[PDB]
Structure 1
């Protein structure tokens, strides 16, 4: 029949030329995909047996008639997908039996209106997708009051030309109702005066609605008297575009009370429309995929608490100083800017990842103009040159330099003044440890990810002596060959240690003594012949030991260690699949060593 993706749980019968639902699919299955099949009529008592089915995909199944009592057995169903079936007309009782549904998707079902749509007894429903249909009425149905849990309604790619005081006269009598709404791709031309007067919405999406800035300006004005936690605006790179987007249009948004204003790709953008005075007293400013190239015309009275800059087109680092700005994100940037000094008093979250960005002279108060900094993300960038030592930024507790070329860190003692840093990641920053005090100063550190770098002479030095409070430590993929003596000797609190994908040939049990707190020791994929050195010395807190895919010498010289494998069977992961490395061995399962030949 189908494809068993998860036995007795999930099946894939997509595009199988099936004409009815299969008959020998378990009753335990929770997820069934029947998209792209000539089902034509969804017969009555079809899914009778499937009492645990929670998600049913019937996308494009040529369904023309939902027969009476079709959903009988499916009282536990929660996701019902009906995209692209020509079931134009839904007779009442269409959705009877679906007593547990939170998600109905009737996209491209040729749905004409929401008033006819028989969902009023779907009390469990949360999301309703009715995009890509023939809905002409922006009316929010009266049965919505029953739909006590339904909080998202998308009507994209429909024909809606008019929002009228009546359409929304339901959000009126129900201020207590938290509703998100999206009507992108509707050819709206007329919004009735005082329409949105008195209504609250969580989020509202208006993308590719406006043929002319004039139609827009005028319409945008009547949004007056509306509270929106989040209003997203802009257009698509492949749809009804604007000829000119003039900062003036936003006039009228000076009535609508806004918390978060999100801008997306515009056909014509001015680096100034973002400066506009109707954006003065916003708490959250978001730009995503914007043709913005420069940003510095930001007045000091703008009450911004956050700023988000994503997939944008900045040619030089912004230069700002908004007093109340707590969080700043600048990520995924078209070109390759370079850091530029900026003073933000209230800054406590700085997010600067995934820009071909270079930063030289990092870091201290002067760099940013605050002490309150807790988060700082500088990962997936370019050349980060280490100059100063985080002097003045003590409150910082999250440092991330992943895959970014750090410079001059082995040189000085870079992190020297970070007595509160809890999370440091220097993974794949392509580093070679020379200096012993690299991590000197990080006495509050807990998590140290630092994988895929390397060490002098491929020997594990003593960079961890002061990193007392460590619980997660990751030296995976670090071309290691040997570990030096008192390396792990202060970590009386470490829980997890990853030394996977190295070149260790053995393990000295003595190393891991003093690790009174250790639970997972991953030493998978290495050139590990054996362990040596009082096997009783391994911490009695260690529960998961991983020596998979190694090269264990089943020689008599390691009689003791080979016994240890037995005494501590249950604690090694996949012991039963471990195979010897040495003489004639292959079919020779490690846990089978005896005790005779020469010994």
Structure 2
């Protein structure tokens, strides 16, 4: 069969097969058909009579110039239609006749010059329309949109809109039941007429790479006046040379909008102000700063009423002091600069993600660090040296804890989680941890996920350090340089479904070491130099054999490389 078969009687990827005609040899039950990159040229009446069940139809880049009325006539169960990259020069009035289910239409780069003559007014079930990268130069919304009641996403990015006039959204105004996300990214925009957005509300507005000047952006923002939006996103990724100044007053126009959530993604711009720059955002529930440089200023510590604060991929010069009474979720991630955590006062913080910053933590972890007792989630992975001093005092409600790839100090010779009786997920992988003290994990009676890959053990021996972890479901001991296991090590792990022991130096295991893993569903034992010289291997070869469905990858013996599951000992 020329057509690649992905899922029988369901999916087919007839990609680039020089099809001049729709393949008739295919089944009738096919729900997903990809005909992308085939010279179809013209889609005639009932082009798809042979596909009753079709739900997804990809006609990407099939040099289609004409689509006749009823080309998709019988496609009553089609939901997504991809036309992307077809040089359409003739669309009949009824080219989309029969598409009584269509929820998504992608018509990127279809030489579309305007929405006015686009014959889609009758597709009531349409939820998504993507017309990015066409020649559309008008923001005027066609009168048929009034029939497009379920439309939730309009993609107008990469077109030719330079001006938005007061008269452009009259039809949208008469639709006070619509929930529309609009993206106008990459339109050459210079003017938005004041008042055009009064009494308008959108779920989301994206404006990225739209303005040639931080004086033209301002003019366009003043024409946004009256707009009530759930999520405003302002992006600019085109800065080349030095870091560019983001004028402190460039945002004072945002006071005359209603925004619930705000993101500013201004690549290599730098802020020399905070308080007045972000004044018009004081009451936003979700604030977001991405890719910006914040050196001169270092204190968001005001009374901003933000509940969610996201600071990602920025340059800081120093870890900023934050003091916010209403912040519940903080995301401080993938930033560079000032490699040192500094105490914050964030009462009512429930979620704290501080991963991937290279930060050092000289004392950790307690309430006096964070200003909260409500912490449920704490992620300190991919940072520098974390020195433990406090056993999570004021933070006993923790349910998720992640330290992976951070250098942890004063943890292994202690019982630092003794108070964490609600902890469900703990990851200490690659934390320079060297196990000795059998008490390392005491107190973790409700723990289910324990990741400790890439560490090591005193004498490469795994002692009975999982005794009180009766709720354990997932355990990763991969890459731990293990040479010997304790025979009673997994005795309590009655609920363990996943055991990963791959990439160790295990030659053998104690007989009956899995006897009590009655819940075990998946096991990794590969990349270990197993020794298949009977009776030594008998227990393991026997166990892997009858439990073969459970084994992930392939355990093999040193030398022969024969699968350990394949060995039969006398």
> Could you state the TM-score of these two structures normalised by the residue count of structure 2?
0.89
2:255 alignment partner, SS class: coil
Q: Please give the root-mean-square deviation of Cα atoms over the aligned residues, in Å.
A: 3.4
The structure-2 alpha-carbon separation of the partners of 1:437 and 1:77, relative to structure 1 and needing over 3 Å to count, comes to same
Q: Does 1:80 align with 2:81?
A: yes
1:213 alignment partner, SS class: coil
Q: Does 1:480 align with 2:456?
A: no
1:188 match: 189
Q: How does 1:149-548 map to 2 (within 5 A)?
A: 149-237=150-238, 245-266=246-267, 268-272=269-273, 275-293=277-295, 295-298=297-300, 300-335=302-337, 337-508=339-510, 510-513=512-515, 518-520=519-521, 522-525=523-526
Cα displacement (A) at 1:256: 0.8
2:310 alignment partner, SS class: strand
Cα displacement (A) at 1:131: 1.1
2:4 match: 4
Asked if structure 1 preserves the Cα contact closer than 8 Å seen for 2:486 and 2:510, the reply is no
Q: Does 1:110 align with 2:111?
A: yes
Cα displacement (A) at 1:152: 0.5
**Distance (Å, rounded) in 1 between the aligned partners of 2:469 and 2:388:** 21
Asked if structure 2 preserves the Cα contact closer than 8 Å seen for 1:213 and 1:244, the reply is no
**Distance (Å, rounded) in 2 between the aligned partners of 1:51 and 1:328:** 49
**Distance (Å, rounded) in 1 between the aligned partners of 2:486 and 2:313:** 45
Asked if structure 2 preserves the Cα contact closer than 8 Å seen for 1:130 and 1:154, the reply is yes
**Distance (Å, rounded) in 2 between the aligned partners of 1:35 and 1:356:** 45
Asked if structure 2 preserves the Cα contact closer than 8 Å seen for 1:161 and 1:186, the reply is yes
Cα displacement (A) at 1:278: 1.1
**Distance (Å, rounded) in 1 between the aligned partners of 2:327 and 2:401:** 20
Identify the match of residue 572 of structure 1 among 530, 548, 552: 548
**Distance (Å, rounded) in 2 between the aligned partners of 1:37 and 1:380:** 47
The structure-2 alpha-carbon separation of the partners of 1:115 and 1:482, relative to structure 1 and needing over 3 Å to count, comes to same
The structure-2 alpha-carbon separation of the partners of 1:363 and 1:560, relative to structure 1 and needing over 3 Å to count, comes to closer
Q: Does 1:41 align with 2:64?
A: no
Asked if structure 2 preserves the Cα contact closer than 8 Å seen for 1:485 and 1:511, the reply is yes
Cα displacement (A) at 1:228: 0.9
**Distance (Å, rounded) in 2 between the aligned partners of 1:360 and 1:102:** 54
Asked if structure 2 preserves the Cα contact closer than 8 Å seen for 1:211 and 1:242, the reply is no
Cα displacement (A) at 1:521: 5.4
1:533 match: none
TM-superposition CA deviations, 1:439-458 (whole Å, max 9, x none): 12323322212223222222
Asked if structure 1 preserves the Cα contact closer than 8 Å seen for 2:495 and 2:520, the reply is no
Asked if structure 1 preserves the Cα contact closer than 8 Å seen for 2:554 and 2:563, the reply is no
2:228 alignment partner, SS class: strand
TM-superposition CA deviations, 1:50-87 (whole Å, max 9, x none): 23333333222221111232223433222211122111
Cα displacement (A) at 1:264: 0.6
- Structure 1: runs of 5+ lacking an equivalent: 529-549
1:247 alignment partner, SS class: coil
Asked if structure 2 preserves the Cα contact closer than 8 Å seen for 1:336 and 1:356, the reply is no
Cα displacement (A) at 1:581: 6.2
Which deviates the most, 136-145 or 25-34?
Answer: 25-34
The structure-2 alpha-carbon separation of the partners of 1:579 and 1:363, relative to structure 1 and needing over 3 Å to count, comes to closer
Asked if structure 1 preserves the Cα contact closer than 8 Å seen for 2:525 and 2:555, the reply is no
Cα displacement (A) at 1:502: 3.5
**Distance (Å, rounded) in 1 between the aligned partners of 2:165 and 2:248:** 26
Q: How does 1:580-599 map to 2 (within 5 A)?
A: 590=566
Q: How does 1:118-157 map to 2 (within 5 A)?
A: 118-157=119-158
**Distance (Å, rounded) in 2 between the aligned partners of 1:202 and 1:417:** 43
**Distance (Å, rounded) in 2 between the aligned partners of 1:210 and 1:578:** 56
**Distance (Å, rounded) in 1 between the aligned partners of 2:114 and 2:144:** 13
